[PDB]
C-alpha cells in the first residue's frame, strides 16, 4: 500500500534517464564539425550544463576532454576520413532528493563520408562506459553503485541541397544501445528492510533529427547558424523492478518516451586551427524534457 | 613550428639600397675577377612588382586533333593538315554563319576576310579583353596557311597594345 | 609510286612530323615493294598499331591501323607482398606503361619478369596473367592476374668440415635462423641472397679472429626442396691449423710520431693471430694520424705468413698526406634557426689544421643541443688545391616548442583553464622563452621565463623567472586558506669542462598564509617558529619574506637531445636562505638518468632513472611546509594520482569559523574530522626517493621513415616520502610516516609522440602495491586533463 513508492520508483526512473539521456551525443555537440579539416589530431575539449524539467527537477554538468588522429584514407563511397578518438567523462549532477557524480572513458572512432555535402553518414562507433557514484538522501540510504555500458551507432542520413553557399539542410537519425546493472539493495525506514532490485534497463534510444544549417563567412573565419529539430524516442523502456514494501509484491515498469528537442546552436572556425563554437538546446513534450542546457565546444588541430 | 611560407604577393624588393660602387685609392687594386655575382646593365624596360603579368603567355587549346594550337606574342594558330585542302572552308563558313559572328566585308569569291572586333570575358584576373581577329586561309597546296592578325586590342573600349 | 598522302589514320600517339622523320615511304622518289616492307617493319619496330596493314590505292599507301593505343591503366590484382610502385617500376623496366602503345607480343615475358622479381624475394611459386578490356574508342587496359604461392623456409643450415667448433654455435652467430623459439620469437625462416653473403662474411670473420689465419670458404650450395617449399644450405670450409703472432714491423713515413704508434703496436710475444685486432690496430693508426692533421693517409696491413713453423708477422705501411684542410665551414638546411646558433658549438675553427676528432666533437654537440632531428657531417675537398677542405654539416630541423593546455573539471561550475607554451629556441635566436599559467574559480597562477644560453661567447648563460600565485580560495567569503605568493629569480651559470656546468643566483619568494586549517604538521612548523595560534580557531595570518642563494651542477652527456640512446645525465640542485631572511631551510634535489644500449644498431636500450631529495631547518626551525616534495603522477611515479604519495594530514577538531554551512566545507569542523583523526589529503613531507626503470623497444607497426619519431617502452617504478620530523611517541595510533620502508611500486606500458603540439605521452599502469588511501589512475596523458 506504499503510495509514495510511486515517487520513489519515479526517482529511480529519473536516475536511469539521468545517466543515459545525459550521456548522448551527436557528432554535433561533441566535435562541432569535421568537414574540411587539415592536420593530424586535436584536443576535443567540451563542457555543458542542462538542468532537467521532469517530475523531480534536476541539474547537470559535464567535461569531455579528448584526443585523436585521423589519417586521410580516401577508400570507399563518399569522402572517408577515418579517425581515432578517446574521451574522459567526469559528469556531475543532482536531483530533488540526492546527488551523484561519475568518471568515465571510452573509444570514439568516426568517419566523414556524409555524401561529401552533409549527411552525417559516418562510422561513429562510440564505446563508452560508466561507474556511477551516487548518494541518496531519501532517508539517508546513501549508496548504491554499479557500472554500465553504452554502445553507439553513429551515422545519420542527410541529403544536402546546398543551392547556395549557406544552406546546410540534412536529416539526422540515430539509435544507441546499452544496459545499466542489477542494482540490489533495500531502503530501510520501517524496520523490515524495504528492498528494490532493478534487474537491468537495456534501453534503445532513437531520434530522427533534421538540420537546417545556415553558413556565413568572414575574411578567414567561418561562422554558421546551426538550427535543428527532430524526434527523440526509445524502444525498450522495460525498467521493471521489485517492490518489497513488506506488504506484498508489485511490478511497475516504464514506457516509451517521446520528446522533440529544439536547437539554436552555431559554430566558428577562426584561424583554421581553432574551431570554437557555442551551442544551445531545448526540449518539449513532457518527459524528462531538458530546459536550460548550453553546450560549449572546442578543438585545436595541429 | 618550422615553415609556413606564403608568397601570394610581396613588395619588399623595390627598396634595397642601390649598388654604390666601391672606389679605391692610389695603389690598392682589388681582384674582382672572380666576379660571377655581376649584374650586367640593361636598358629598362618594363614593369616592376604587381604591374607585371605572371599569368602565363597565351597558348590556345586545340578544337580538332592535329591542330597546332600555338600562340606566341599576340598571334594564335589553328593549323590543321588533313587529306585535302577543300574541307576546312565550308566548316569555317558554317561556324561563322550559324554561330552568329559579325563581319563587315567578305569577298565570298575569295577566302580573305576582314572582320569587326570581338569581345571575350575571363574572370582569371580582374580585367577584360576585346579585339579584331583576321583569319587568312590561303591554299598553298594540300595544306592550308592559316594566320591571325589582331589590329586593335581594346580593353572594354580602350585600345592598348 | 607517286604518293600524295601517307595515311596515318587514328594514331592517337604520334603526329605527322615524327611519322615523316621515321618514314620509309618518303615522298619524291619511286617507291617499290621493298619500301613497303620497310614501312611495315618500321611501324613494327615502333609498335603503335595492332596490325600494320598497308594498302596501295592507285598510287598512295594506307595502313589499316588497328588500335593498340592506349595502355589505359595498369591494374594489379592483390599483390599482398610487394608495393605496386615496385611493380610499376619493374614494368617500365620491361618497356610498357600508360600512354604508350600496346605490345601484345611481350605480355608473357613481362609476367616472367614478375616471376623473377618474386624469385628474388624468397617466394618461388608464382604465376601472373594479363587481360585486356575494351573502353571508349581508344582505351584498352592490361590487368595483371596474380597467384603468389608461399615464401620458402630454410630447413637446415648445414656445415661440413668443421672439426674445431660446434655447428650450433656458428648457426646461432649467423644472421639467418632455421629454428626460432616460440617463447622468444625473434626472426622468421625466410631466405635472401644478401643475408647469405652477409652470413658468409660473418662466419669467415668468426674463424679469422681465432688464429686460423689460412681458413677459407671452399664452396657454397643452396638447393631447392623439390616442392617449391624448402631451402637447404650447405657450406664447406677448411679450418687449417691456427697460427701465432710473432712481431709487428710497422714501417714507412711516419712524420715524427713513432712513439705512440709503437704504443699502439703492443703484442704479447706469443699471442694468437686476431684478424679483428689487426684491423683495429690499423684503424687506430689511421685515426691517430688523423688527429694531428693528416686526415687522408693510406695505411695497408699485410699478414706475411710462415707456414713452416706456423707463426705470422705483420708488416704495416703508412703515408703522410698534408694538413691545413679547413678553409670554410658552412651549414646547410638550417632554414629557420640562426647561423651563429650553430657556430657557437663548433670546436673546429676555420683556418686551422684539420682535427678529425674536433669535427666529431662538433657533430656530437650539435646533436646534444636538441633543436635538430639529424646531423650528418661531411668533408669535401676544394678542386685545384691539394690540401684544403670545406667541412659541411647537413642539418634537418625539428619542431621544438609546445602548446600545452587542457581543462578537465570537478566541482559544480564548469571552470578550469590550465594553459601554457614552452617555446625553447624561440625564433631561432637560441633563447628559451617559456610562459605557462592558469586561472580558476579561486586560484590564479602565472609563470614566465627566459634564459639566453650564450649571454657571452665563453658559455656563461644567464636566466630568469617570475611567478605570481594567488590561492584566493573564496569558498564563501574569506578566511579559507588564502595563500598569496609571488617572487622572482636569476640563475647565472657557466660551464667548467666539456660536459659539466655550475650555477648561482638569488631568488626572493614572498609568501602569505591566511586562515589555514589547524592541522598537525603545519602547526608543528608554526609553533616551532615562535608564532603560536589558537588550536581550535580557524583564524591566523602568517606572512613571511625571505631570500635565497640558488646553486647547482649538471653533467650532460648523451647521444641525442630528445630521444637518447646512450650516455647519462645528472643535476644536483640546491638552495639555502641567506641570513636576514625569515626562515632557515636548505634542500637538495638530485635528478639522474642513464641509458645503456642493447643492440649495436641502437633500437633496444635499457633505461634508468632516479630522483632524490631532502630538506631541513637551520637551527630549531623547519623547512617551511609550503615547499615539501610531492611525488606521484605522470613523469615522476606513473600510475597513481598527481601529488598523492606520502603522508596524509591530520586534523584537530573545530567549532566555529564563520564559514561552515550545513554539510559544506568538510574541513575538520564539528561536522566531520574531529580531534586527531586521519583524512585523505596529500600534504607532502620533506624527503623523497623515487627510482624507476624502463625498457625501450621499437614501435611495432610504423615504418622507419617517421618511426624515428616514436618510442614505445615498458617500465617499472617505485616511490616514497616521509617526514624526518614526524614524531611517533605521542601519535601512536597513526601510521608512522617517519618510516621510509613503505615503497609503492607500479608497472605498465608507455607510448610517446613528437606531434606538432610537442611531446605527447600515453601510459597505462597498475599499482602493484598501495597503502591507506592512494587514488590510482590506470590511464594518463597530456593533451588535456588526466583520467
Amino acid at each position: 500500500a506504499n503510495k509514495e513508492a510511486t515517487r520513489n520508483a519515479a526517482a529511480l526512473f529519473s536516475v536511469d534517464y539521468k545517466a543515459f539521456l545525459n550521456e548522448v551525443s551527436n557528432l554535433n555537440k561533441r566535435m562541432g564539425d569535421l568537414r574540411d579539416i587539415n592536420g593530424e589530431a586535436g584536443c576535443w575539449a567540451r563542457i555543458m550544463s542542462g538542468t532537467g524539467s521532469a517530475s523531480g527537477g534536476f541539474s547537470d554538468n559535464y567535461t569531455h576532454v579528448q584526443v585523436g588522429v585521423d589519417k586521410k584514407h580516401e577508400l570507399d563511397g563518399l569522402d572517408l576520413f577515418t579517425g581515432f578518438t578517446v574521451t574522459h567523462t567526469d559528469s556531475s549532477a543532482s536531483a530533488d532528493v540526492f546527488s551523484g557524480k561519475t568518471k568515465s572513458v571510452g573509444a570514439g572512432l568516426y568517419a566523414s563520408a556524409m555524401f561529401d555535402s552533409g549527411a552525417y553518414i559516418d562510422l561513429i562507433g562510440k564505446y563508452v562506459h560508466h561507474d556511477n557514484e551516487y548518494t541518496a538522501t531519501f532517508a539517508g540510504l546513501g549508496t548504491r553503485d554499479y557500472s554500465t555500458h553504452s554502445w553507439y551507432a553513429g551515422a545519420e542520413a542527410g541529403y544536402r541541397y546546398h543551392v547556395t553557399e549557406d544552406a546546410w539542410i540534412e536529416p539526422q537519425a540515430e539509435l544507441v544501445y546499452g544496459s545499466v546493472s542489477g542494482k540490489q539493495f533495500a531502503w530501510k525506514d520501517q524496520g523490515m528492510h524495504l528492498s528494490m532490485k532493478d534487474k537491468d534497463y537495456n534501453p534503445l534510444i532513437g531520434r530522427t533529427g533534421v538540420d537546417v544549417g545556415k553558413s556565413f563567412s568572414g575574411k578567414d573565419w567561418k561562422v554558421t547558424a546551426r538550427a535543428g529539430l527532430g524526434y527523440q524516442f526509445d524502444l525498450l523502456a522495460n525498467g521493471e523492478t521489485v517492490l518489497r514494501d513488506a506488504s506484498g509484491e508489485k511490478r511497475i515498469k516504464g514506457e516509451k518516451d517521446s520528446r522533440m528537442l529544439m536547437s539554436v546552436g552555431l559554430n566558428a572556425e577562426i584561424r583554421d586551427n581553432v574551431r570554437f563554437g557555442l551551442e544551445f538546446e531545448k526540449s518539449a513534450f513532457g518527459k524528462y524534457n531538458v530546459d536550460n542546457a548550453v553546450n560549449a565546444n572546442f578543438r585545436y588541430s595541429f | 613550428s618550422r615553415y609556413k611560407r606564403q608568397v601570394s604577393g610581396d613588395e619588399a624588393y623595390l627598396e634595397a639600397a642601390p649598388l654604390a660602387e666601391l672606389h679605391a685609392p692610389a695603389g690598392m687594386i682589388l681582384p674582382v675577377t672572380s666576379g660571377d655575382y655581376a649584374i650586367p646593365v640593361t636598358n629598362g624596360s618594363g614593369a616592376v612588382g604587381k604591374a607585371l603579368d605572371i599569368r602565363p603567355p597565351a597558348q590556345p587549346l586545340a578544337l580538332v586533333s592535329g591542330a597546332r594550337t600555338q600562340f606566341t606574342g599576340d598571334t594564335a594558330s589553328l593549323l590543321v593538315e588533313n587529306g585535302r585542302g577543300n574541307t576546312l572552308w565550308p566548316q569555317v563558313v558554317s561556324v561563322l554563319q550559324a554561330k552568329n559572328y559579325t563581319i563587315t566585308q567578305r569577298d565570298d569569291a575569295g577566302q580573305t576576310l576582314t572582320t569587326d572586333w570581338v569581345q571575350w570575358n575571363r574572370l582569371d584576373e580582374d580585367e577584360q579583353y576585346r579585339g579584331r581577329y583576321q583569319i587568312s586561309v590561303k591554299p598553298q597546296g594540300y595544306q592550308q596557311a592559316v594566320t591571325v592578325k589582331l589590329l586593335n586590342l581594346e580593353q572594354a573600349g580602350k585600345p592598348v597594345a | 609510286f607517286v604518293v600524295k598522302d601517307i595515311h596515318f589514320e587514328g594514331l592517337q600517339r604520334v603526329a605527322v612530323g615524327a611519322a615523316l622523320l621515321s618514314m620509309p615511304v618518303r615522298t619524291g622518289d619511286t617507291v617499290n615493294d621493298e619500301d613497303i616492307s620497310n614501312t611495315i617493319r618500321a611501324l613494327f619496330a615502333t609498335g603503335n598499331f595492332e596490325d600494320v596493314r598497308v594498302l596501295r590505292d592507285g598510287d598512295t599507301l594506307l595502313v589499316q591501323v588497328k588500335e593498340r593505343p592506349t595502355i589505359a591503366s595498369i591494374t594489379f590484382s592483390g599483390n599482398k607482398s610487394v608495393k605496386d610502385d615496385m611493380l610499376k617500376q619493374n614494368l617500365e623496366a620491361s618497356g610498357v606503361r600508360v600512354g604508350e602503345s600496346l605490345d601484345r607480343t611481350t605480355i608473357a615475358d613481362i609476367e616472367k619478369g614478375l616471376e623473377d622479381f618474386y624469385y628474388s624475394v624468397g617466394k618461388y611459386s608464382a604465376s601472373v596473367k594479363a587481360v585486356v578490356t575494351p573502353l571508349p574508342r581508344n582505351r584498352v587496359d592490361l590487368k595483371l592476374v596474380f597467384q603468389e604461392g608461399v615464401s620458402a623456409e630454410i630447413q637446415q643450415i648445414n656445415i661440413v668440415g668443421n672439426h674445431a667448433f660446434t655447428t650450433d654455435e656458428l648457426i646461432s652467430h649467423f644472421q639467418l635462423r632455421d629454428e626460432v623459439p616460440w617463447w622468444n620469437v625473434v626472426g622468421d625462416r625466410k631466405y635472401q641472397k644478401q643475408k647469405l653473403a652477409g652470413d658468409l662474411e660473418t662466419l669467415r670473420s668468426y674463424y679469422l679472429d681465432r688464429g686460423y689465419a689460412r681458413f677459407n670458404i671452399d664452396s657454397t650450395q643452396v638447393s631447392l626442396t623439390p616442392d617449391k617449399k624448402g631451402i637447404y644450405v650447405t657450406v664447406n670450409i677448411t679450418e687449417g691449423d691456427q697460427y701465432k703472432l710473432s712481431g709487428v714491423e710497422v714501417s714507412g713515413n711516419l712524420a715524427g710520431h713513432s712513439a705512440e704508434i709503437e704504443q699502439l703496436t703492443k703484442i704479447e710475444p706469443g699471442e694468437l693471430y686476431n684478424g679483428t685486432k689487426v684491423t683495429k690496430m690499423e684503424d687506430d693508426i689511421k685515426k691517430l694520424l688523423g688527429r694531428y692533421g693528416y686526415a687522408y693517409p693510406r695505411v695497408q696491413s699485410m699478414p706475411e705468413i710462415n707456414d713452416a713453423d706456423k707463426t705470422v708477422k705483420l708488416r704495416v705501411n703508412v703515408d703522410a698526406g698534408n694538413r691545413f684542410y679547413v678553409r670554410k665551414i658552412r651549414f646547410e638546411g638550417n632554414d629557420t634557426s640562426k647561423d651563429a646558433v650553430l657556430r657557437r658549438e663548433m670546436r673546429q675553427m676555420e683556418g686551422a689544421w684539420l682535427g678529425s676528432d674536433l669535427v666529431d666533437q662538433g657533430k656530437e654537440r650539435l646533436n646534444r643541443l636538441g633543436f635538430f632531428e639529424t646531423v650528418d657531417t661531411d668533408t669535401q675537398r676544394v678542386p685545384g688545391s691539394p690540401d684544403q677542405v670545406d667541412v659541411v654539416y647537413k642539418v634537418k630541423e625539428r619542431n621544438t616548442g609546445s602548446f600545452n593546455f587542457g581543462i578537465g573539471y570537478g566541482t559544480e561550475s564548469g571552470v578550469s583553464f590550465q594553459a601554457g607554451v614552452q617555446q625553447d629556441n624561440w625564433l631561432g635566436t637560441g633563447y628559451a622563452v617559456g610562459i605557462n599559467g592558469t586561472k580558476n574559480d579561486y586560484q590564479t597562477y602565472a609563470e614566465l621565463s627566459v634564459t639566453n644560453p650564450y649571454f657571452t661567447v665563453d658559455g656563461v648563460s644567464l636566466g630568469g623567472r617570475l611567478f605570481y600565485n594567488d590561492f584566493q580560495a573564496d569558498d564563501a567569503d574569506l578566511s579559507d586558506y588564502t595563500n598569496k605568493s609571488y617572487g622572482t629569480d636569476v640563475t647565472l651559470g657557466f660551464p667548467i669542462n666539456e660536459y659539466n656546468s655550475l650555477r648561482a643566483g638569488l631568488g626572493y619568494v614572498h609568501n602569505s598564509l591566511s586562515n589555514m586549517q589547524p592541522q598537525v604538521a603545519m602547526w608543528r612548523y608554526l609553533y616551532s617558529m615562535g608564532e603560536h595560534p589558537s588550536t581550535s580557531d580557524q583564524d591566523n595570518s602568517f606572512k613571511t619574506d625571505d631570500f635565497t642563494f640558488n646553486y647547482g651542477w649538471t653533467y650532460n652527456k648523451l647521444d641525442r637531445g630528445y630521444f637518447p640512446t646512450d650516455g647519462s645525465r645528472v643535476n644536483l640542485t640546491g638552495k639555502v636562505t641567506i641570513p636576514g631572511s625569515d626562515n632557515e631551510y636548505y634542500k637538495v634535489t638530485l635528478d639522474t638518468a642513464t641509458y645503456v644500449p642493447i643492440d649495436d644498431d641502437h633500437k633496444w636500450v635499457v633505461l634508468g632513472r632516479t630522483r632524490w631529495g631532502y630538506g631541513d631547518g637551520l637551527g630549531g626551525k623547519e623547512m617551511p611546509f609550503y615547499e615539501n616534495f610531492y611525488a606521484g603522477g605522470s613523469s615522476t611515479v606513473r600510475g597513481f594520482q598527481s601529488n598523492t604519495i606520502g603522508p596524509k594530514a591530520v586534523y584537530f577538531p573545530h567549532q566555529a569559523s564563520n564559514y561552515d554551512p550545513d554539510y559544506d566545507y568538510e574541513c575538520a569542523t564539528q561536522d566531520g574530522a574531529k580531534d586527531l583523526c586521519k583524512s585523505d589529503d596529500a600534504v607532502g613531507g620533506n624527503a623523497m626517493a623515487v627510482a624507476s626503470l624502463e625498457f625501450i623497444t621499437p614501435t611495432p607497426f610504423i615504418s622507419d621513415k617517421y618511426a624515428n619519431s616514436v618510442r614505445t617502452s615498458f617500465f617499472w617504478d617505485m616511490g616514497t616520502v616521509w617526514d624526518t620530523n614526524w614524531d611517533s611517541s605521542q601519535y601512536s595510533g597513526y601510521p608512522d610516516y617517519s618510516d621510509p620502508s613503505n615503497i609503492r611500486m607500479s608497472a605498465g606500458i608507455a607510448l610517446q609522440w613528437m606531434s606538432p603540439l610537442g611531446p605527447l605521452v600515453f601510459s597505462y599502469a597498475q599499482p602493484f602495491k598501495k597503502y591507506d588511501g592512494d587514488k590510482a589512475e590506470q590511464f594518463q596523458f597530456n593533451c588535456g586533463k588526466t583520467w
Partner: protein, 218 residues
C-alpha cells in the same frame, strides 16, 4: 575523380577554376587533361599553366620538378623566358616567406642556399634574353639578392671577430671584398678587417686597410 569529357571542355572549366581562385579543382582538371593526353596539341599550354598553378598555390617542389622536366623535354621554345623566370621566382620564394616576420626578424642568416640558386637562375635569364618583357623585375631581384648574400657573409665575419679566431675573419672579409665589392655589407665590414689585422700585429696591412676605409668614407 576525373570527369571523362571532351578536352576543350576540360580546359574551359579549368580556366574558370583558375578564374575563381579555385586552384585545387584547377590543378585537378589540368593534371588530368595533361597526363591522360600525353601528346595533346596543346600540352605546352597546359604544362605552362600547370606551373603557374603549382606556384600560385604555394607548394614549390612540384613546381621546380615540372619546370625542370619542361626544360629537359622542350629544350627550345618561343616562350622559354617565362620558364626561366618562373624557376627563379620559385627559388626566391623558397628563400624567405615564413610570415613569422611580423615580429620583425631580419632573416639574413638562415642558409643562403636558395638565394644563391635564385641568383644563378635570374642571371642566366637576364644574360639570355635581355630585351624580353621579364627583365626589369629580374634586375631588381638581382640587386636584392646580391645584397642578401653579402649580408650573410658579413654575419659570419662578425661572429668570428666576436669569438677571436682572427684569420678566419680576414678570409671571410677577403671574400666579401672579392665577390661583392659594391654592396653595403662590405662597406660595413672593412673595419672588421682593420681590427683583425691589428690584433695579429701586422701593422702595415692595417694601415693599408685604413687608407681604403678613408678613401670611401662619407
Amino acid at each position: 575523380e576525373v570527369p571523362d569529357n571532351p578536352p576543350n571542355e576540360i580546359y574551359a572549366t579549368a580556366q574558370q577554376k583558375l578564374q575563381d581562385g579555385n586552384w585545387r579543382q584547377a590543378i585537378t582538371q589540368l593534371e588530368a587533361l595533361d597526363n591522360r593526353y600525353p601528346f595533346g596539341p596543346y600540352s605546352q599550354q597546359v604544362q605552362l599553366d600547370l606551373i603557374y598553378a603549382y606556384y600560385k598555390n604555394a607548394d614549390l617542389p612540384l613546381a621546380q620538378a615540372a619546370i625542370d622536366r619542361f626544360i629537359r623535354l622542350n629544350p627550345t621554345h618561343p616562350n622559354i623566358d617565362y620558364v626561366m623566370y618562373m624557376r627563379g621566382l620559385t627559388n626566391m620564394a623558397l628563400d624567405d616567406s615564413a610570415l613569422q616576420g611580423f615580429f620583425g626578424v631580419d632573416r639574413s642568416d638562415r642558409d643562403p642556399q636558395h638565394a644563391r640558386a635564385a641568383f644563378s637562375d635570374f642571371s642566366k635569364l637576364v644574360r639570355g634574353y635581355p630585351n624580353s618583357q621579364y627583365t626589369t623585375d629580374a634586375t631588381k631581384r638581382l640587386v636584392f639578392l646580391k645584397d642578401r648574400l653579402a649580408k650573410y657573409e658579413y654575419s659570419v665575419a662578425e661572429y668570428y671577430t666576436e669569438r677571436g679566431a682572427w684569420v678566419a675573419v680576414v678570409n671571410r672579409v677577403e671574400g666579401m671584398l672579392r665577390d661583392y665589392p659594391d654592396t653595403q655589407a662590405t662597406r660595413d665590414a672593412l673595419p672588421l678587417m682593420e681590427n683583425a689585422y691589428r690584433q695579429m700585429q701586422m701593422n702595415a696591412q692595417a694601415e693599408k686597410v685604413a687608407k681604403i676605409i678613408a678613401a670611401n668614407s662619407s
